[PDB]
Amino acid sequence: MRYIHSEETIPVPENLKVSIKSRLVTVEGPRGKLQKDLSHIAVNFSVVKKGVIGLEIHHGSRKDVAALRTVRTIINNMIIGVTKGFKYKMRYVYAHFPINVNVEKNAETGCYEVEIRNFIGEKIVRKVVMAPGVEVEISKAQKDELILSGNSLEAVSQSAADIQQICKVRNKDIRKFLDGIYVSEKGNIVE
Amino acid sequence: PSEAGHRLYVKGRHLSYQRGRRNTHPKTSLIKIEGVDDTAAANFYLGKRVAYVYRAQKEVRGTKIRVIWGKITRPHGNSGVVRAKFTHPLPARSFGASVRIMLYPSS
């Protein structure tokens, strides 16, 4: 079973610009610019209407057509991200031993780095380098919050996963020792 | 003046003998003709004459160059290779050498 024609459309708001060349997408708007390369997928791009982009695959199989929506949702996420940004929230959870962190400022480059001390009462100092373009803040709204913000969802989420994955308990029952840092809510910078 | 060349023959190559997979027969040889792909085009050279020219060491009768004469017998395969028959079988060291295709028996 080979499918003749499968098509979807993406609207574009009247605020930003997008240009595609040789399967390389450039999106630039009020909050910056992003680049992505999609040369590994055979897709045909076209301009359906004044503000609608269409893309399609011809004579594809079910497995090939399955990947068609993935680019659509990635491009939509980039469109949202370049006009509204992204924001993740994190909480610290300890029972007895407090954990203290220090998100020091730029280290002579755009990258931020986070220092974590006193995890389950350990004297190890553990060092993490954030992806470029992501801003880390200690919240002042109320206590025990870590604020992550940025332009790209992939970098914001991966950096959050780095923070989550670096605080691990070893040789203990993790159903009893619930210590660690976890993400609790994801959203946009505006509203 | 008159810097052009002097050629009135077609160049060809000596490929191999006639053989199965483990037995060879030096009686007939195989020649690759320049520019021929199918047997319809290869039909033009049936009955023509081929020559093999080589250099010797001694002076015998006004020359140091010998020739072996032969003629094309029938086509071979679908790739335009042709079979040939010589007065003497080729020296078996010329697998890859070149031969001259004349145009004497015309039409």
């Binding site: 997928i41 055979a42 090939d64 | 160049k11 190559r13 490929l15 690759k32 320049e34 520019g35 792909d37 697998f95 890859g96 050498a97 070149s98």
Partner: protein
């Protein structure tokens, strides 16, 4: 078909075994071959399979003495291509040795072999054989993760010769301008009847 004195093939974009079979046949026929840019060939399938295949090749060695008789594992892309071609030729005979003597292989474009026209064999291009969406790797990368040491020197050297060819292209574009304007200016002015005579003859 045609017989040239020597032919130079640019290796970028050709499958290893399909190029090696054509080359081994031309060599046994009597042609002379020079292959250039051996670091840009391709192998079908995802990279990990090629790496596992090479590791299985690397595990072979003579037991009683590794300095003699054992399979010597060359680490260069050109030597990998040379092994592929050598496996398709009866290299243990005088005829095979003579056939192999007509072949030269290099990485990059050596100074002897630039300033020349680079040929293409259309029976081995990847873009005309493989399915879009399939996976392939690069011989240069495979040699990188097996011990090739001169990847960065050739990579840095190649942009210099590409800048020189850019300047030569600029000169060629300028040179075309006089010939193009000359044909238009000359043809109209002079010839009264050579024009339609050539047109009627197809020129």
């Amino acid at each position: 078909s045609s017989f040239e004195s020597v032919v130079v093939i640019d290796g970028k974009g050709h499958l290893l075994g399909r190029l090696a079979s054509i080359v081994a046949k031309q060599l046994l026929s009597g042609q002379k071959i020079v292959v250039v840019r051996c670091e840009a060939l391709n192998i079908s399938g995802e990279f990990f399979r090629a790496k596992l295949k090479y590791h299985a090749y690397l595990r072979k060695m003579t037991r009683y003495n590794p300095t003699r008789g054992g399979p010597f594992h060359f680490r260069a892309p050109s030597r990998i291509f040379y092994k592929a071609v050598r496996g398709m030729i009866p290299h243990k005979t005088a005829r095979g040795a003579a056939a192999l003597e007509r072949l030269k292989v290099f990485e990059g474009v050596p100074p002897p072999y630039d300033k020349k026209k680079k040929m293409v064999v259309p029976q081995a291009l990847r873009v005309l054989r493989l399915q879009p969406g399939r996976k392939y790797c690069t011989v240069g990368r495979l040699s990188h993760e097996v011990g090739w040491k001169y990847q960065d020197v050739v990579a840095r050297l190649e942009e210099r010769r590409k800048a020189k060819g850019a300047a030569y292209y600029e000169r060629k574009k300028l040179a075309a301008r006089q010939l193009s304007e000359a044909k238009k200016a000359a043809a109209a002015k002079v010839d009264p009847k050579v024009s339609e005579a050539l047109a009627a003859y197809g020129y």
